[PDB]
Design a protein around this ligand. Structure first.
Ligand SMILES: Cc1cccc(-n2nc(C(C)(C)C)cc2NC(=O)Nc2ccc(Nc3ncnc4ccc(N)cc34)cc2)c1
Ligand SMILES: CCCCCCCCO[C@@H]1O[C@H](CO)[C@@H](O)[C@H](O)[C@H]1O
Length: 337
């Protein structure tokens, strides 16, 4: 069933791809070409992974990304159109290519190139939360949500991805404080930071580093209360928190001047320091702010995903063979009609 492959050098890089994919053109940097998919009609991104089996960290990362992308089947989350290698045997297996729908803009472009209406914010944050509900239901935490990880087309349809502007700006305070474990609601923190930026056109917490990032956060939300202090396991974190000059929680309505009050109320529900008290993605979808999009009959959950597999301690050649099996067992999506 093997397709016919053709070779081409593109910016001093070899590219060996099925005939299916035509008119490869580099779009930046592994490395990515825009292509025409003759099978489907669609414009695609073909990403040739960089040194996928260089080391155990690379091989594991390769395996994890392939497995995750094979699992994602939701309108607001990146999906896999195809995965291929030009190898006809495991023994000649060294290259992995991923194929996805080609993206135009990201949300860093739309924010930095527009003044967004409240109506448009409603729709974009809705879709982010709808993809997160799905991702979170598989017990997956994104951990890296920021505008550049959110693709948005000319129809304002949005997809969550991970390309793999500081990330720290959108990171929950518990990750700043190097918390041992963290909750799925770290991602809700990020959405709050993103939503804020879409409403104001400004980075909410542009910390120059991690201590500075905490400082800026605490300025808005206040220093921890005695309920929250009681939940700090770390002796060192606990001392440092108790060492702070107490700051009061700001009223977000006096900060987000001119914004829709329902949008402000939601921000108050997302940007809570205590993560146990943060609104969840599924709860967020039912907030009055999304009254005109929310459809509890069309906000699906994912099948369970076994994370134990990508976390084993295996040799390079074993991750390699496992990745090969995932490539071979790939079943393509159905075409539209
Ligand atoms: C590194 C890594 C490791 C493990 C998992 C991931 N994740 N995780 C996810 C979630 C949690 C959201 C399921 C998604 C991914 N991987 C991912 O999104 N991969 C991806 C992202 C962007 C592209 N690239 C382009 N695509 C579409 N148009 C373009 C147009 C231009 C351009 N330069 C690039 C592109 C290809 C693959 C990522
Ligand atoms: C000084 C700023 C540090 C405040 C960090 C507290 C915010 C995190 O909140 C904490 O998240 C944990 C991780 O999932 C949970 O186990 C705790 O119950 C929760 O209170």
């Amino acid at each position: 069933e093997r397709p016919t492959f053709y070779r081409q050098e593109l910016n001093k890089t070899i590219w060996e791809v099925p005939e299916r994919y035509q008119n490869l053109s580099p779009v930046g940097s592994g490395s990515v070409c825009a292509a025409f998919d003759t099978k489907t009609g669609l414009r695609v991104a073909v990403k040739k992974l960089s040194r996928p089996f260089q080391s155990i960290i690379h091989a594991k990362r390769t395996y994890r990304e392939l497995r995750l992308l094979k699992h994602m089947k939701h309108e607001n989350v990146i999906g896999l159109l195809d995965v291929f290698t030009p190898a006809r045997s495991l023994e000649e297996f060294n290259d992995v290519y991923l194929v996805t729908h080609l993206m135009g803009a990201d949300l860093n472009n739309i924010v930095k190139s527009q003044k967004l209406t409240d109506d448009h914010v409603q729709f974009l944050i809705y879709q982010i939360l709808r993809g997160l509900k799905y991702i979170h239901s598989a017990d997956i935490i994104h951990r890296d949500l920021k505008p550049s990880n959110l693709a948005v087309n000319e129809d304002s349809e949005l997809k969550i991805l991970d390309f793999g502007v500081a990330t720290r700006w959108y990171r929950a305070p518990e990750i700043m404080l190097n918390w041992m474990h963290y909750n799925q609601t770290v991602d809700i923190w990020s959405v709050g930071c993103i939503m804020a930026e879409l409403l104001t056109g400004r980075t909410l917490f542009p910390g120059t580093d991690h201590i500075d990032q905490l400082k800026l956060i605490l300025r808005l939300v206040g220093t921890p209360g005695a309920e929250l202090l009681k939940k700090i396991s770390s002796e060192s974190a606990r001392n440092y928190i108790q060492s702070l000059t107490q700051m009061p929680k700001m009223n977000f309505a006096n900060v987000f001047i001119g914004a829709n009050p329902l949008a402000v109320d939601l921000l108050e529900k997302m940007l809570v320091l205590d993560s146990d008290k943060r609104i969840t993605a599924a709860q967020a979808l039912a907030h009055a702010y999304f009254a005109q999009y929310h459809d509890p009959d069309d906000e699906p959950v994912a099948d369970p995903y076994d994370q134990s597999l990508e976390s084993r301690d295996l040799l390079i050649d074993e991750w390699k063979s496992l990745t090969y099996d995932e490539v071979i067992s790939f079943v393509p999506p159905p075409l539209d009609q």
